[PDB]
Structures are given as structure tokens and as C-alpha cells.
Amino acid sequence: NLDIIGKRIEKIKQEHETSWHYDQDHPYKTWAYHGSYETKQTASSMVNGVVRLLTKPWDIIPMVTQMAMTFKEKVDTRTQEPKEGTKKLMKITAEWLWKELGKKKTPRMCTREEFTRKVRSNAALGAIFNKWKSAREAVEDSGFWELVDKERNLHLEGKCETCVYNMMSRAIWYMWLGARFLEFEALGFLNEDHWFSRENSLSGVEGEGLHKLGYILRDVSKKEGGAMYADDTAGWDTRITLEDLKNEEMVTNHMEGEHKKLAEAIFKLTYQNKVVRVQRPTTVMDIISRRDQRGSGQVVTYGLNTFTNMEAQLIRQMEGEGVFKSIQHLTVTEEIAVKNWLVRVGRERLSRMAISGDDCVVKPLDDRFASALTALNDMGKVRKDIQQWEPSRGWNDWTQVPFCSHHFHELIMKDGRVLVVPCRNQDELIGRARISQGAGWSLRETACLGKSYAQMWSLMYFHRRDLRLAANAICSAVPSHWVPTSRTTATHEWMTTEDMLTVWNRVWIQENPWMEDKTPVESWEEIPYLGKREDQWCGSLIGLTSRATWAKNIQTAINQVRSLIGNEEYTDYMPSMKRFRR
Numbered sequence: 001n002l003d004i005i006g007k008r009i010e011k012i013k014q015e016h017e018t019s020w021h022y023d024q025d026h027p028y029k030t031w032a033y034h035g036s037y038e039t040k041q042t043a044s045s046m047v048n049g050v051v052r053l054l055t056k057p058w059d060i061i062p063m064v065t066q067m068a069m070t071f072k073e074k075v076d077t078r079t080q081e082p083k084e085g086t087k088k089l090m091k092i093t094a095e096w097l098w099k100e101l102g103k104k105k106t107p108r109m110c111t112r113e114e115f116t117r118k119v120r121s122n123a124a125l126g127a128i129f130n131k132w133k134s135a136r137e138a139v140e141d142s143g144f145w146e147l148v149d150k151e152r153n154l155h156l157e158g159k160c161e162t163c164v165y166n167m168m169s170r171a172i173w174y175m176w177l178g179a180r181f182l183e184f185e186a187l188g189f190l191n192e193d194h195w196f197s198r199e200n201s202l203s204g205v206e207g208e209g210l211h212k213l214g215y216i217l218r219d220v221s222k223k224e225g226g227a228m229y230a231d232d233t234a235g236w237d238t239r240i241t242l243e244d245l246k247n248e249e250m251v252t253n254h255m256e257g258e259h260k261k262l263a264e265a266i267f268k269l270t271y272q273n274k275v276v277r278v279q280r281p282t283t284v285m286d287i288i289s290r291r292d293q294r295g296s297g298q299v300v301t302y303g304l305n306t307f308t309n310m311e312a313q314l315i316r317q318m319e320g321e322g323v324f325k326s327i328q329h330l331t332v333t334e335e336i337a338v339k340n341w342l343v344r345v346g347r348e349r350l351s352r353m354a355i356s357g358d359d360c361v362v363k364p365l366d367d368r369f370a371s372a373l374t375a376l377n378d379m380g381k382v383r384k385d386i387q388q389w390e391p392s393r394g395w396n397d398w399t400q401v402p403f404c405s406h407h408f409h410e411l412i413m414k415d416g417r418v419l420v421v422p423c424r425n426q427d428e429l430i431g432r433a434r435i436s437q438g439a440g441w442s443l444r445e446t447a448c449l450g451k452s453y454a455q456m457w458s459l460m461y462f463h464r465r466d467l468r469l470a471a472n473a474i475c476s477a478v479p480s481h482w483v484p485t486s487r488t489t490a491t492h493e494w495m496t497t498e499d500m501l502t503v504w505n506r507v508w509i510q511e512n513p514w515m516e517d518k519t520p521v522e523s524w525e526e527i528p529y530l531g532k533r534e535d536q537w538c539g540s541l542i543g544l545t546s547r548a549t550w551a552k553n554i555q556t557a558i559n560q561v562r563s564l565i566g567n568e569e570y571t572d573y574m575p576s577m578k579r580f581r582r
């Protein structure tokens with residue numbers, strides 16, 4: 001308790017001395033309270049006019065229009081320590097898993113050089129804006145690294161000072177840029193050297209990208225077994241138990257020297273002990289500790305979520321296969337079987353799973369999995385939108401399975417070659433493209449974000465009619481040579497000024513390991529759509545008056561935007577479409 005966290009606590013206490021008080025009406029139970037000090041201040045979702053002007057029919061679809069307008073009583077719930085039988089299975093699996101992830105990997109500290117190169121190309125590392133201003137500035141200053149160094153040597157002694165979380169079904173936990181570095185130095189390797197690639201982790205999909213996920217599920221489907229299950233966990237970050245945080249820490253048994261200690265520090269002092277600063281209108285800043293839950297770097301979170309989820313799902317598989325009988329206690333002769341299962345078939349069982357953070361698809365050996373819930377529910381990994389003890393509804397077709405907000409279509413090119421293409425409700429896709437995050441955007445920046453979306457649609461969602469059209473319109477309405485932008489950057493191959501037909505060929509034909517014939521496609525008309533009825537089901541306006549008026553007169557919308565932007569150099573991309581071709 002207060003020995004490990006109190007130092008950090010005292011330091012803030014003293015900086016806001018003229019304000020301190022123990023508020024006798026503090027709304028926490030599960031969060032350990034400490035006090036309050038005076039503040040007064042807060043970003044909301046602005047509309048992108050380049051994208052909106054070029055998608056007029058949607059100005060009247062509420063599912064689209066509402067997306068641009070607008071539980072903290074779930075971060076304040078407490079998870080129950082698992083049984084002795086559960087806690088044993090988790091610890092055995094974590095060991096075997098970590099060793100497997102490390103069989104062909106070397107843990108290693110990430111560097112200041114690598115950290116600087118991250119910041120000098122916009123990758124949301126979650127910092128605060130105060131002694132400097134932006135991320136860029138502070139990295140180029142030497143004083144910073146003297147503060148970073150103090151804390152680094154502090155960590156080598158097992159004490160912490162400036163590493164405090166800032167809260168703001170999502171809960172974002174911004175840290176000050178220094179503690180970010182040190183979190184990155186120790187654990188960045190997990191991300192940077194791809195510990196959860198599919199090659200390496202067998203269940204994982206890090207670095208895979210939306211044009212592979214579909215092919216991966218279809219490969220999974222090919223295994224002999226039961227239904228594909230895809231259970232969403234209810235508030236996964238909040239259901240991370242202290243035993244989870246401890247099994248994750250077992251990565252350090254793979255380390256040495258300076259590293260092993262620094263890794264051990266981050267886990268000990270920031271992950272398995274926490275300190276956080278939250279707003280409250282009655283306006284103040286409450287300083288609260290808790291020992292468990294997730295509250296890390298958005299990246300490390302991903303890797304450790306994937307790891308613990310991989311673990312849960314091997315175990316739930318075990319309960320289905322009847323490897324263990326009860327979670328109340330493991331017999332010694334049950335350990336020998338649990339251990340031998342992992343060694344005999346564990347790798348094969350990882351290959352029946354596609355896991356991306358809190359998100360999974362399991363094709364288990366049979367449908368006993370569906371009702372194997374004791375370990376799952378006892379680990380705290382309790383299922384969303386279904387009763388605790390009601391068995392899992394599982395999917396019979398891989399083209400129906402939800403995965404990373406998407407579903408995946410099989411789609412036969414006019415030449416017999418097979419595309420597996422990502423997809424989701426068109427109102428969702430068009431709604432996101434109509435939205436920008438932040439203040440002080442120029443028409444040029446707004447235009448270049450519009451372009452980023454258009455090029456994604458062209459690469460990923462070319463098979464949806466409204467999107468190939470809106471995409472050609474946007475790319476026509478925005479100067480040909482202006483570069484796509486994005487303030488919060490998976491593989492993102494649409495971020496480029498290259499010919500989008502050339503990028504398509506490289507991605508879907510040339511580099512696509514599931515495509516044997518490498519015959520490049522010569523024009524967009526060779527590139528097919530979903531069925532017209534399939535397009536409507538996935539939220540197309542094809543067949544409506546308004547949609548046809550829009551298509552008819554598209555060149556008039558394109559010019560409207562061109563007129564606002566100015567006398568630049570523009571290309572007409574609509575003659576790539578059969579119907580705008582004479």
C-alpha cells in the first residue's frame with residue numbers, strides 16, 4: 001500500500017499545498033481516495049466538410065448524422081480473486097506461453113533514438129501538454145532527459161515519483177511524456193519486435209492489416225472442429241485481476257541486467273500499483289490509487305491484453321476438452337495432464353484462434369467449448385450481452401463471424417480469382433469519414449484527411465458501390481499532389497500519393513500469399529463489387545432516388561469543393577467507372 005504509492009502522493013500534495021483537503025463526500029468505493037485540489041477546464045467531434053459536401057444523400061440518414069453530435073460506473077467495480085484451481089491453470093499457461101513467444105525472440109530495451117523517431121512522425125503515445133508544449137519540443141531538450149534520468153535511477157532502487165495516470169466503454173489514461181519513455185524502454189520490445197505477429201504467436205494478428213484478417217478467419221475455418229465462437233468480454237480492461245498483472249510480469253524471467261530490473265519496476269510500481277488524477281464538477285482533481293485493472297500505454301495494453309486473452313482461451317478450450325474437472329483445486333496428476341496438453345497440442349490450439357487484444361475468434365475442437373464457462377467466469381472474463389451461465393451462441397459460417405468491428409465476404413473476380421474483403425455497415429464507414437478530431441484545421445488539412453479516407457475506401461472497401469464512387473469523387477475534388485494526413489495513425493498502405501490502382505495490385509495480388517496467379521489488374525473495371533442485393537444488406541443506398549441524383553450530378557459536387565479550395569491541379573478519377581466512361 002502507501003509506502004510504494006505515497007512518495008508520488010506527497011509530491012503532488014506539496015505542489016498543490018494551498019488547495020489540499022480530504023473530501024468527506026468522495027464518490028469512490030473500489031478506488032482508494034487520498035484528497036483533492038482546485039482546477040477548472042475540460043475536445044469534441046468536428047465535421048469534415050470536404051467529405052460531407054461529397055456525400056450529400058447521407059445528410060438525411062440519422063445513423064450517419066447522429067455520429068457527429070454529443071460507464072465510469074464500470075471502472076468503479078471490483079473483481080473477486082479466482083479459486084486456487086483457476087490461479088494454478090493461469091500461472092502454468094502464462095509460463096508455457098511466454099516461453100513459446102520467446103523461443104525465437106530476445107527481450108531488449110528500446111532506446112531514446114527509437115522514442116524520438118516515434119514522436120517525429122505522429123504515433124499517439126498518450127502524453128500531456130506543463131514545462132514545454134508539444135511532444136516534438138521536449139525530446140530535443142536535454143533538461144527533460146535529466147528528469148527522465150532521475151526517475152530512471154529511482155526505478156533501479158524500487159521507488160517512483162512522477163509516474164501518475166490521468167483518466168479522461170472507453171477510458172483513456174494519459175501519462176506525462178517521461179514515464180511513457182520508461183514504459184516504452186522496458187516493454188516497447190513486445191510491439192517493436194512483433195511478439196504477437198501470427199508467424200510468432202500463432203493466435204495473434206499484430207501487423208496483419210484489414211486485407212489479411214478475412215483470409216486468416218477462412219484459414220481458421222478450414223480446421224476440423226465446431227462452430228467459430230467470438231464472445232465479446234464486458235469491459236475487458238476493468239476485468240484484469242492482480243493475478244493477470246502478475247502472470248504478465250513473468251515476461252521478466254526472460255530478461256537480464258539493467259532491463260530485468262527496469263521491466264520489473266514498471267510492472268511493480270505503475271501496473272500492480274497505480275496513482276491517477278480525475279476531474280469532478282462539484283471543479284477539482286481527486287488523487288486515487290488501486291492495485292489491479294488495466295491502465296498502461298495504449299500499445300503495451302494491446303500486447304498484454306492479447307497475451308492474457310490467448311491464455312484465458314487456451315484454458316477455456318482445456319475445460320471444453322475435459323483436461324481438468326474443477327476450478328476449486330487442481331490435483332497434482334491434473335497438473336501433469338494440463339502441462340502435457342500444452343506440450344502435446346498447445347501450439348495446434350493457438351492456431352485455432354485469431355486474437356487482437358480483448359477481441360477473439362476460437363474454432364475449438366468441438367462444441368463442448370460453448371458451455372465450458374467455469375474458468376472463463378472465474379478468471380473475471382465474463383461475457384457481454386448473455387446470462388453468466390447461458391451457453392455461447394456460435395457462428396456456422398466464417399463470413400458471418402464478427403472480428404475487429406468487421407465481417408468478411410468471399411468475392412469472385414471476373415477471372416475466377418478469389419478475394420476475401422473486409423466490410424461493415426456503410427453508415428458506420430461514411431459517419432467516421434465525416435468526422436475530424438481537434439481544433440485549428442485548414443481547408444487543405446481537412447481536404448487531406450478527406451483523401452486519407454477516400455484512399456482507405458478504395459483499397460479496403462472498393463467492393464461497395466457508394467464508397468468506390470464517393471472515393472473517386474473526393475480524390476477528384478482534392479488536388480492530385482496533396483498528401484493524405486491523420487493525427488492518430490495496423491498496416492496503413494492507403495497513406496501515399498502513389499497510383500491507387502498500383503497500390504491495389506501490390507496489396508491484393510502481388511503481396512497476397514492466398515493469390516497464386518500474380519496477373520496484375522490493368523483497370524478498376526476488372527475489380528468486382530459485392531452482389532447488388534449483398535451491397536444493400538450491408539447498408540448501400542443503390543436503388544434510392546437521392547443516391548441516383550447524387551451519382552448523376554457527381555461532377556457538380558466535385559466542382560463545388562474545387563471552387564472552395566481554389567485554382568490548384570486536379571485529376572478527374574470518375575472515367576475509371578464504367579458508367580462515367582462515355
Ligand SMILES: Clc1cccc2[nH]cnc12
Pocket residue numbers: 095096097099343
Ligand atoms: Cl517449466 C516450462 C515452462 C514452459 C514450457 C515448458 N515445457 C516444458 N517445461 C516447461
Ligand SMILES: [Zn+2]
Pocket residue numbers: 151155159160161162163179269
Ligand atoms: Zn516512476
Ligand SMILES: [Zn+2]
Pocket residue numbers: 407409423424538
Ligand atoms: Zn458486408
